[PDB]
Ligand binder design. Structure first.
Ligand SMILES: Nc1ncnc2c1ncn2[C@@H]1O[C@H](COP(=O)(O)OP(=O)(O)O)[C@@H](O)[C@H]1O
Ligand SMILES: Nc1ncnc2c1ncn2[C@@H]1O[C@H](COP(=O)(O)OP(=O)(O)O)[C@@H](O)[C@H]1O
Ligand SMILES: Nc1ncnc2c1ncn2[C@@H]1O[C@H](COP(=O)(O)OP(=O)(O)O)[C@@H](O)[C@H]1O
Ligand SMILES: Nc1ncnc2c1ncn2[C@@H]1O[C@H](COP(=O)(O)OP(=O)(O)O)[C@@H](O)[C@H]1O
Ligand SMILES: Nc1ncnc2c1ncn2[C@@H]1O[C@H](COP(=O)(O)OP(=O)(O)O)[C@@H](O)[C@H]1O
Ligand SMILES: Nc1ncnc2c1ncn2[C@@H]1O[C@H](COP(=O)(O)OP(=O)(O)O)[C@@H](O)[C@H]1O
Ligand SMILES: [Cl-]
Ligand SMILES: [Cl-]
Ligand SMILES: [Mg+2]
Ligand SMILES: [Mg+2]
Ligand SMILES: [Mg+2]
Ligand SMILES: [Mg+2]
Ligand SMILES: [Mg+2]
Lengths: 270, 270, 270, 270, 270, 274
DNA sequence: TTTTTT
């Protein structure tokens, strides 16, 4: 009875960060009890179209709204997202544990986040069960980055994510993987623009984001990976951890990284 | 003369849990004898468009409603749906026949419904005709879960059901299938959110529901499937059901499952 | 006035069981001579949209209506459709000719119509020209079943039929085909619920219907379809159909099957 | 009045049997000089939509207007289309030249036209330049049949024609081609009902029409086409057909086939 | 009012032979300065739809208009397009230079343009730098034919062009190219009607146009191209070109071919 | 009520989007709704019950114009327009110094570049070959960036689509060609090298008969030396970069910017026959 | 959805 206003619903949707049709529809129809517009919505002979468009719009921003930030801004935004309690000390504990000086990682982490040529790829090498996927997965999750599945490597579309995320991580690189790297991904390592295909869409011309790599292989040593030497910052995690006792081993959480970034914000040149 | 009110149809559709076009259309056109709106519906020049949208809208509400519950609230609702007479005894019987203590299955079932990391995968391995498919099938049917079709698993779009159903089932996993699981779905097993891709402009990092699996392969034994050992609870049916000449044997039904949960509600920690 | 009434055309269409655009369009334009509405139709600036939607709408009902019945009820209805004169003896005669005790094909057919898991697939194996397609096709025609066309298996829309018909038939399965079946469709041959993809519509999890396959291959012998053994029932066809005789001594018809079901109704547990 | 009447255009298009957009649009725009409606057409802000729909509407008739007929009726209709002057002698001459009895061809053609199982495929094998395509194309032309380009087999939409025409022709089948046939098209070659996939529309179940195939390969001889034997028939044009004189000695026309059918109408059981 | 007139834009578009959206859109918006309609177009809330439909409309005319001529008529019209000054001697000289009697070329050309089965394909073979692509391209360019890129043959849509032009050219055919031809395109080299798929649109059955091919391989010599012998007319361009100082001693242009045809119209049986 | 003046005007949006060179829906949408604070039309836009469709079409429209504008220009005009774009301060001397460092007479490079830009047959491809770390990609990328060229990624040659860009840019660059790549060139792209038309196939759209633009290639392989690349010899101008641009620690000798090229073209416009 | 992508 009060002519439905799309823009309003979008706003609404956008405010509650509701981005999937299914929800928008439902949640709104609920607010129909105490909301003239919502009520107006259910009156529409085209709820369908709106719910769709509503979402389309919402995500539209959200994506765009994020693509906007700068690494700092972005990392700042990724902090508001971190919920719960923890402390940078946890991270420090671990690195110390691996016999690595946090400053070393910090210094490494500074040029990384900045995507500085030849300082754009961090590798965590070591025997199995040393915390490699741990850390790297926890950091990526924090940063809201994408994990690359080198299994799909057969398809050149296994890099499609690189056109979106701020940070990608290739977990457990094998010789076949490193070879791939040394062969086709050199630019992704020299900060030169690189082409990246997208399912059904046109290729994108972008700068390859920060890369995280875990491997049992010390590329730094193997001679067939020469080009990679100067292009991969390597930390060697040797001391094990996951022991035969069932006990919950270390686990850096979003919170932890929150503290880390918040407390090191000065030193990281952010 | 009265105008066709879409919203009404949707409500109707929603009240009868009529989610598929084919039906909605037919069933409504039937209530056209004693329903002004339906009669208004058949009067429309866009019946098609409506039926379509009607369905779209309904599934919307359903999906949103389905994901809203809590495993318990959900299960509880799945019981109300269970019509007919049966008894938990049928199930106990069979597990016994299969030489397994119900308590074992109950415990495993507990953590499963709770989707606890590493216990989120139930497997029923055994030689042909030992009753794996129905058990699984019957359980999934009761739970209102979806059946994944491995036949389309490339590009993983054989995981889009994963963003909706409270429990899926992989009936008859082949080496090729388990390989796939050991390769891409490790997360659906540890608890870490799985990147459930999908068709239109948006993908969702959803949490994988409990999984059910039937197979002739005993992943626990094979060594190439090491990762899956600690992440797949294996129950094995070695006794044959084959027996079928004359007396029409076993078939677990929604009712049977109703009794099962009702009477084991306490123990299941629901 | 002469405002075109869509709902009318549909009814029309529906009455004559006209479900394909091509026809509906043509046939109607014909009724334009003695029908105000069809004449109105040809007056529409959007006949296209109407023929399309009309059809869509018609199939909509039809499905709903067919999916509604029971197998006997369906079969029963498939009998009303069978016109002409023939007899069950023709069927008997042929099976005898192939040296197969009718009771054997009846007992098999009983559980086949019932779709009991794993007794849902019948294979008619034998050297070329033994009446296999001949038979299968007839029985499928009578049931108004659909043919899957493996040449399209490359498209996940090939099984669409499976979400509509009460019985499907794979005529002349090669090795490639049996391979595929053993590899993906075990949940189908079994006759359990499977997810079917359809163009324009949404996924559909319906119980895979009864299957009929004809082949030069004895999947029961080959150790490579090892796992198709507990699923495919077989009927060997050794004796030749035609052999220097104007017209095939055997050629079963709807009528013949009509007799068959009519006279064998009680034995088939219908 | 000066309103653009769609129905009119359709009639027009239909009368001239103009079924492809390209033409419809062009040919009409020409008649715009002396036709109020066409002129009205060019005035529309949605010519596009019309040309498209207009075509859609025309081929709709044409298809039904065909599938409705009967081979006798259809061939009959194909003769009225045959213009010019020729004589069945020309065809006879050729077949004699190739050293074959006209009663043999006819005997085959009779069954062929009737689309009888496994007697639905005629292959004209022989060395290059023996007039095979020459003959086969001319017949298909007369019959208004469609051709299948194997270069498109990669797409399941290559057989889309089969759901329309009364006769298909595979000109110059290579090994790859026969292999495909022996593997996926036994149904079709068998003139049995195969499901044909079409773009945007759903799969159509129809009886595979009669097939013509020219080939340097005698499937009858080769042993790997063992199963093609009982489905293919075969003719052998062993005698060279093109001469030194620019204009080749044999070149049949519609007229030629007209006579052929008209005079042989009785023997062909039409 | 002066509401945007679609037909006008189309006319404009057509007159300038602007057929791709990208241009039409841009070029029109430019004429917006001195064009009431263009200005009205920019005022449309649906320019998108219009640019598209305009293109669609234009192409239709463009194609329809070309498939509409007779080889003579077409060639005739292609002459009017030929601007500048040149002469057949210039074409001649070259052929003589290559040690080839013009009449030899003319005789083949006559039948080629007529598209007579199996004489529908010319091939210019020879060592690199002998003016093959030179000639062919110039001739295609005057005829206004399209060029096919074997770099795309992995998608049958690389032949889409065939369904439009009156003359196609495969420049620099390699072994893999000839093989593809010997395997799939026998029909096409033969100039018989064939099926041509088109992205999203529907397939068009049409007579393969005249082919021009340049290659370092002499198909008539190789024996694995046995069957391309009766289809491919060969030419031996051996004499190198650009000798000393880069300066191209040969430059064939539209004008040149204009003369060629104009003067040789009689002999070419046009 | 009657007479609306604030009414949402699509064309306006497009112009806006066009001006800022915003071509992707995601952005347009966001960036516009932001300008909604101080923009009657933007505000009108948000008032629309069909923002979706507009964002889409806006975009659709922007590229139409954008793609067309480029293809539109002449090599001169294009390069001219590429200059206005170049911001910052640099100098052609930076480029001279580098080539000099590489022991190559700038005139040599200039003489070739003059013909490259013209896209003249058999001189339509430049290759910068030499041991690793000699500033090849360095130079080539910079030049491509200024020109607004597109980079091809042989890591996708698998699908014939890896060349879709060739239907748009006025210059493409294949960085670090392996043997496999060169073979691919010698095999298929022989027309791209002779100026004769080739059919670029886009995704979901009909192919396009286009004239392959100028090509830039950097590689460790001297196609000029190898014998399995005979055809290429006369179709690939080669520059050998022997000297190591290598910069020990933080302090890069050679860096080349849009500015640097700006000066370069501005000051050499004459000699480049532009 | 078909074309892509597989
Ligand atoms: N998927 C995961 N979930 C939770 N923790 C993980 C996961 N992957 C790795 N970790 C953590 O990282 C450590 C294991 O690193 P690891 O996986 O052994 O490197 P690698 O795989 O090369 O042997 C463990 O201490 C564990 O806490
Ligand atoms: N719905 C049912 N009705 C009657 N019998 C059934 C039903 N489902 C399964 N069965 C019986 O159980 C057997 C199938 O057991 P099955 O599910 O194939 O075990 P598995 O999956 O390990 O191969 C069949 O032989 C069948 O007789
Ligand atoms: N509808 C029919 N009309 C006339 N003859 C038929 C018909 N169906 C089959 N036949 C005869 O039977 C033979 C085909 O048997 P077939 O179906 O191919 O056995 P199978 O399927 O095991 O290969 C043909 O030679 C044909 O003469
Ligand atoms: N429409 C036609 N007009 C004139 N001559 C034709 C025509 N069709 C075929 N020919 C002649 O017939 C010969 C081709 O016979 P052919 O088709 O190659 O038999 P096959 O297909 O078995 O190899 C050609 O040399 C050509 O001159
Ligand atoms: N349209 C033209 N104008 C001027 N010269 C041309 C033209 N076309 C070709 N040429 C000359 O011919 C030579 C190329 O011959 P070429 O195309 O390499 O034969 P092919 O294509 O078989 O390798 C070039 O050196 C060029 O100077
Ligand atoms: N635009 C630039 N700004 C500053 N330094 C650069 C720039 N481009 C390249 N370099 C320096 O040159 C090195 C890269 O040389 P490189 O491009 O790999 O030569 P090539 O392309 O032959 O392999 C880097 O270490 C970097 O310090
Ligand atoms: Cl099993
Ligand atoms: Cl058979
Ligand atoms: Mg089973
Ligand atoms: Mg058969
Ligand atoms: Mg032939
Ligand atoms: Mg050439
Ligand atoms: Mg480099």
């Amino acid at each position: 009875t009060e002519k439905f206003d799309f823009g309003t619903m979008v706003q609404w949707a956008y405010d509650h960060k509701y981005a999937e049709e299914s929800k928008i529809a439902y949640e709104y129809a609920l607010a129909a009890g105490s909301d003239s517009n919502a009520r107006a919505f259910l009156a529409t002979n085209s709820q369908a179209k709106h719910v769709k468009d509503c979402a389309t719009m919402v995500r539209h921003y959200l994506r765009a709204e994020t693509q906007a930030l700068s690494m700092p801004a972005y990392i700042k935004a990724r902090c508001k997202l971190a919920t719960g309690e923890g402390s940078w000390k946890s991270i420090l504990t671990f690195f110390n544990y691996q016999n690595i000086e946090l400053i070393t990682f910090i210094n490494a982490l500074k040029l990384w986040l900045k995507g500085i040529p030849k300082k754009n790829c961090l590798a965590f090498i070591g025997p199995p069960n040393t915390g490699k996927s741990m850390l790297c997965n926890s950091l990526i999750h924090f940063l809201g980055g994408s994990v690359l599945s080198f299994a799909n490597h057969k398809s050149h579309f296994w890099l499609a994510s690189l056109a979106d995320t701020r940070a990608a991580l290739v977990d457990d690189a094998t010789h076949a993987c490193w070879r791939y790297f040394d062969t086709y991904l050199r630019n992704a390592l020299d900060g030169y623009p690189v082409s990246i295909d997208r399912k059904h869409k046109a290729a994108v011309q972008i700068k390859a984001p920060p890369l995280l790599v875990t491997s049992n292989i010390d590329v730094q040593a193997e001679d067939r990976y020469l080009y990679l030497h100067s292009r991969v910052q390597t930390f060697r995690f040797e001391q094990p951890c996951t022991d035969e006792s069932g006990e919950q081993p270390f686990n850096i959480t979003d919170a932890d990284w929150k503290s880390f970034f918040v407390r090191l914000w000065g030193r990281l040149d952010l």
